[PDB]
Amino acid sequence: DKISHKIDIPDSAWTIGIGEKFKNAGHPNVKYPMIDDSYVQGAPLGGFGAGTIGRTYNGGFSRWHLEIGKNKYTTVYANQFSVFQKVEGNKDGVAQVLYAGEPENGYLSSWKWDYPKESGMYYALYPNSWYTYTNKDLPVQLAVKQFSPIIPYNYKETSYPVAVFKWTAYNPTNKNVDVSIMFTWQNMIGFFGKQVNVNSGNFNKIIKDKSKDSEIVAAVMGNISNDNEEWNGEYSIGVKKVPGVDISYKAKFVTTGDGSDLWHEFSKNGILDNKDDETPTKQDGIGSAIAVNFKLQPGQTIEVPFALSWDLPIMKFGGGDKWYKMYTKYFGKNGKNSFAILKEALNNYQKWEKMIDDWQKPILSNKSKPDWYKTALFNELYYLADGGTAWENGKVGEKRTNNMFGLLECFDYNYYETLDVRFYGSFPLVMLWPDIEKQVMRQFADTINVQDSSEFKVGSNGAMAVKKVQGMIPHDLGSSYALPWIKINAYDWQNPNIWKDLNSKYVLLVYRDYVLTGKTDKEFLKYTWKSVKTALDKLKEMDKDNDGIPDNEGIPDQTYDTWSMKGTSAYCGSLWLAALKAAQEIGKVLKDNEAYIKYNEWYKIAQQNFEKELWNGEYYNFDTESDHKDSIMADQLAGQWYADILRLGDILPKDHVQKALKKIYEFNVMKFENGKMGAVNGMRPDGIVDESDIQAQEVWTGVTYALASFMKYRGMTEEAYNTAYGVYKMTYDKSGKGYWFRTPEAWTKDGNYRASMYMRPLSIWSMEV
Numbered sequence: 001d002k003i004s005h006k007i008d009i010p011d012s013a014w015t016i017g018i019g020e021k022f023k024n025a026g027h028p029n030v031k032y033p034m035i036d037d038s039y040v041q042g043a044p045l046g047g048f049g050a051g052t053i054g055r056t057y058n059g060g061f062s063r064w065h066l067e068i069g070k071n072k073y074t075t076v077y078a079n080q081f082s083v084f085q086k087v088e089g090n091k092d093g094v095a096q097v098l099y100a101g102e103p104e105n106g107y108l109s110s111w112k113w114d115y116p117k118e119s120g121m122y123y124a125l126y127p128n129s130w131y132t133y134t135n136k137d138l139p140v141q142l143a144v145k146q147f148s149p150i151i152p153y154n155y156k157e158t159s160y161p162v163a164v165f166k167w168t169a170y171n172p173t174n175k176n177v178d179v180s181i182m183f184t185w186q187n188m189i190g191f192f193g194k195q196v197n198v199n200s201g202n203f204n205k206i207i208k209d210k211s212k213d214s215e216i217v218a219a220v221m222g223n224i225s226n227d228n229e230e231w232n233g234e235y236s237i238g239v240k241k242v243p244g245v246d247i248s249y250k251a252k253f254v255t256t257g258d259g260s261d262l263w264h265e266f267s268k269n270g271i272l273d274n275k276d277d278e279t280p281t282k283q284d285g286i287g288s289a290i291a292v293n294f295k296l297q298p299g300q301t302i303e304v305p306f307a308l309s310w311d312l313p314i315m316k317f318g319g320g321d322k323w324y325k326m327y328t329k330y331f332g333k334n335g336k337n338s339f340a341i342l343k344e345a346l347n348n349y350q351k352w353e354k355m356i357d358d359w360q361k362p363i364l365s366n367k368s369k370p371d372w373y374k375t376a377l378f379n380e381l382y383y384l385a386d387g388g389t390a391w392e393n394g395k396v397g398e399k400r401t402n403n404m405f406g407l408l409e410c411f412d413y414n415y416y417e418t419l420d421v422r423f424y425g426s427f428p429l430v431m432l433w434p435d436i437e438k439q440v441m442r443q444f445a446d447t448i449n450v451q452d453s454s455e456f457k458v459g460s461n462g463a464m465a466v467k468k469v470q471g472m473i474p475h476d477l478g479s480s481y482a483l484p485w486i487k488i489n490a491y492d493w494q495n496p497n498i499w500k501d502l503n504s505k506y507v508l509l510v511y512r513d514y515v516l517t518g519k520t521d522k523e524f525l526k527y528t529w530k531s532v533k534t535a536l537d538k539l540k541e542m543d544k545d546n547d548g549i550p551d552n553e554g555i556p557d558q559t560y561d562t563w564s565m566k567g568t569s570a571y572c573g574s575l576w577l578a579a580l581k582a583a584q585e586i587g588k589v590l591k592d593n594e595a596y597i598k599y600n601e602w603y604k605i606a607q608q609n610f611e612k613e614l615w616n617g618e619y620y621n622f623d624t625e626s627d628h629k630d631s632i633m634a635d636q637l638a639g640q641w642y643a644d645i646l647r648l649g650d651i652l653p654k655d656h657v658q659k660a661l662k663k664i665y666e667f668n669v670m671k672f673e674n675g676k677m678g679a680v681n682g683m684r685p686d687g688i689v690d691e692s693d694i695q696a697q698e699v700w701t702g703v704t705y706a707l708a709s710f711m712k713y714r715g716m717t718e719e720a721y722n723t724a725y726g727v728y729k730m731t732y733d734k735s736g737k738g739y740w741f742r743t744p745e746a747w748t749k750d751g752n753y754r755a756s757m758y759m760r761p762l763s764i765w766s767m768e769v
Ligand SMILES: OC[C@H]1O[C@@H](O)[C@H](O)[C@@H](O)[C@@H]1O
Pocket: 409, 413, 415, 418, 420, 421, 491, 558, 559, 560, 561, 745
């Protein structure tokens, strides 16, 4: 490996061998079907609301999130980088697809597949990833840095459906070597969203943009139809000329054929035919190829940028609504703009790299933090782009100031912005894209007094319930299978209108969003104040025994949606205390004296009773009425965790909080698989895991990172990092279960998982407050 020295990969990048097999991988531990796309994954490409494309560590473009809200894992074999090298003095050169695998059928059989093992590495530190190619039959060493411009406090480039591939080539040998790098791409119009004739009308064109000191050559892969539909638009690939390289291209090769129409050209001398051909296809799949060729002398380095864009302007949801994606604000809505996007990237990528470096640098340069923590912190952010992210710039056919936003909880439970989960998972948005965060919270504010009297069947017990109750915060803002933003509470396993955490979490999120953006946004507190008051007032009505605290009803009426709570619970009870304290403070800020006084009164009574009912000398009991009410819950003081973040002070005595956290570390962490797998949710005082429900026996990744953040603010530095390290290890390490770029909600002691690609572990960003 002589190429690593010519590029700059941070030491905290996650690493794996190209073609590496992983032997320890986990699988779903539930009885119903659940997504398991394997451990062959990578950092995604694509902006927020753009649709994303997962290119895996083996080099394939395989995890397709271009249909917004859906996860489709299938390698499109035509989409690759390939290399040709010939040493001056040899009769023949060699050509190789940079893909550690081969197609399942006979398409593209002429291409040279099966990039060999032990011949290169993949590295990731989101939004950047890299591949290095160090192969005994390739005298010139190559590396590529690939990324999309995901930039905090930037709502523009961050939305773009674009990726850059910056190649570096170095000749460590003592002979001249001719090198070519080729990007191939299938015209994927019709890959989704087209019910019949899936390739029909697809055609490819070549754009040559020549102006002083710029030449870009690109393929634009579109369809002859000018219809405005979810399925129509354009893909583009292309390259910018640099001194010392020549560009060649092929406009049309057949992807549903043996590939030799292209490969016979490339494998001969690394130079394509430059054949334009706009003839549309009927049944056959088609693709384009863009290549560069250059000669490297001994000791010479060259850098060359390629790019990929996709202009698919319309997203459609299963309930019928069609919306424009956010990037259309910057490039237009007609779906004929892939070249403009590609050009913007090829002309600005150096600036983008520097903007990404500038935001990562404060963390990366802090030598008090271990590298493993940096690996997790940055790579967990993959989910902001990969989570079915929807960001609208108008409804199609619509005759507004704001752009609605939604991140899925996950793909198996296909719900937008699940509030009980975003309480943990939304930290990166508030910290790094706060205008999006405030938009999402205003969306929730607007739902508070919505009433929907239609009924649904509750999944857990079969009872009928009202869809949406006035004054109750919704569980979610809909499903991609239905009508995001329009039809709320798609979730139906339990009835969220009787949950005891949603209304409190809502309030806490509101105050969080004010505090963590500088305590300056009074307008945001003004917009949300009525809903905050309404939310707390409605929750107060659920106090059945006048102790001043809402009663859990002996069923799962909160985020642990199979784990029953009854009476006053540490979890919902502490959230309530904190939410009352937050509402007092908002009342002070907005000079609503009667609100301040009322919530202060409720707080003092509830606080006194919470401590009496639950403090047992060592920790706070799980609740007051359940069969295992004395279980040690990992999340027992969630309200105090948020109070620390919101700077609301002590809601419970410092000494008692410290004792509780120490007990959780001693038990839920250190007595669960020797503290190497996170914090298990429920443990009995005798040190055996609580078996009352599956959720008690799970580690929740986002709960564990949040608990780590809580320990950290409370000075328990070693315990905080040791607690988080188990989640990092399970996710990323060779000794783990292979969950990189698909961090799940939960695992059990055997390492197997529930709900890969989950929002909650974005809570790791709470460790940076
Ligand atoms: O793992 C528990 C989670 O399951 C999901 O199906 C629900 O939508 C969440 O509200 C819940 O917290």
